[PDB]
Design a protein around this ligand. Structure first.
Ligand code: CA
Length: 95
């Protein structure tokens, strides 16, 4: 069998569940569950909560937003070949 080039790698497919709404000062949970690599495995997650907080490396992070507003959440995922996909969602924080 010939060695297959890295350019043939299939990228990770992101499943990202961010609720449309959350409440000020209350824990919300986001889910990356189901994210998969069609020809390998998932090697890492990176969530940006959109509020200046440290990013999370968790699959399914909890977070508290401490001001009302709309936040863009970005999830980047790396597969077992070191290659990446990204998705975004918006959450609106109200009282
Ligand atoms: Ca792959």
């Amino acid at each position: 069998a010939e060695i297959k080039d890295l350019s043939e790698n299939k990228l990770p497919v992101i499943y990202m569940h961010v609720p449309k709404s959350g409440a000020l000062n209350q824990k919300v949970v986001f889910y990356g569950k189901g994210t998969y690599d069609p020809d390998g495995s998932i090697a890492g997650y990176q969530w940006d909560f959109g509020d200046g907080s440290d990013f999370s490396s968790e699959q399914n992070p909890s977070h508290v937003y401490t001001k009302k507003g709309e936040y863009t959440v970005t999830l980047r995922v790396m597969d077992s070949s070191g290659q990446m996909s990204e998705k975004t969602m918006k959450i609106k924080i109200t009282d």
